[PDB]
Design a binder for this molecule. Structure first.
Ligand SMILES: [Zn+2]
Ligand SMILES: [Zn+2]
Ligand SMILES: [Zn+2]
Length: 227
């Protein structure tokens, strides 16, 4: 149970909820055909668009509760350690990131991390005290984007609609960069099926641990947009 609440740009904390579209609480989205899968059930929405230079290291921050109610980094914050799963980031080019609706956008995936050598993306999130990082590709066309960030908790993913999606979106303005557009985009809803192998999945191994029995973990959604 966690909430996406700030972005950092090369280490610079952009501000609590600045430029973020956020839910009212930490409850997961479980219906991949719901419009809530796009940016969550958004109830908090500002006019700010964050400046992100192409190539910048971008941080996104997750907290168990909003702001000071999160408490210190511990067993529940940023997320319980049982909530193993991937963490992803997508973008969608828009006209104005402060005013765009979220229906019918063309999303492409810019970062992902899953399971590797017994460690989940979530474990890195915990080690980095709630921050997850990616590099904004240097070749991407400048301008207005919505940035969707996602963590999927898989501790109950064995049953249909058991996967817990923690999601939000950030309003951004990419400066510098290049002229790349993704050749192939995906929709939300649409990109995910409730029976995808990285969504309907029992991650518990022979000794009852979240090791996916050592099998490859197939991150949901499209291939990465690359430079
Ligand atoms: Zn939880
Ligand atoms: Zn706590
Ligand atoms: Zn709690």
């Amino acid at each position: 149970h966690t909430i996406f609440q700030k972005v950092s740009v090369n280490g610079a904390d952009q501000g609590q909820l600045k430029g973020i579209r956020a839910p009212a609480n930490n409850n997961p989205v479980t219906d991949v055909m719901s419009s809530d899968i796009i940016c969550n059930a958004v109830t908090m929405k500002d006019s700010n668009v964050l400046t992100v230079p192409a190539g910048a290291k971008v941080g996104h921050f997750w907290g168990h509760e909003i702001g000071g109610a999160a408490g210190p980094n511990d067993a529940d914050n940023p997320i319980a350690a049982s909530h193993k799963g991937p963490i992803m980031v997508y973008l969608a080019k828009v006209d104005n990131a402060a005013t765009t609706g979220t229906s019918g956008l063309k999303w492409f995936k810019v970062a992902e991390a899953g399971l590797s050598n017994g460690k989940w993306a979530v474990d890195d999130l915990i080690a980095n005290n709630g921050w997850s990082y990616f590099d904004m590709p240097t070749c991407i066309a400048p301008g207005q984007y919505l940035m969707r960030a996602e963590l999927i908790a898989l501790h109950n993913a064995g049953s249909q609609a058991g996967a817990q999606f923690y999601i939000g979106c950030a309003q951004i303005n990419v400066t510098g960069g290049g002229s790349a557009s993704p050749s192939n985009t995906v929709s939300f809803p649409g990109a995910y099926s409730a029976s995808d192998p990285g969504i309907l999945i029992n991650i518990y191994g022979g000794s009852g641990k979240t090791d996916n029995g050592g099998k490859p973990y197939q991150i949901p959604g499209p291939a990465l947009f690359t430079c």
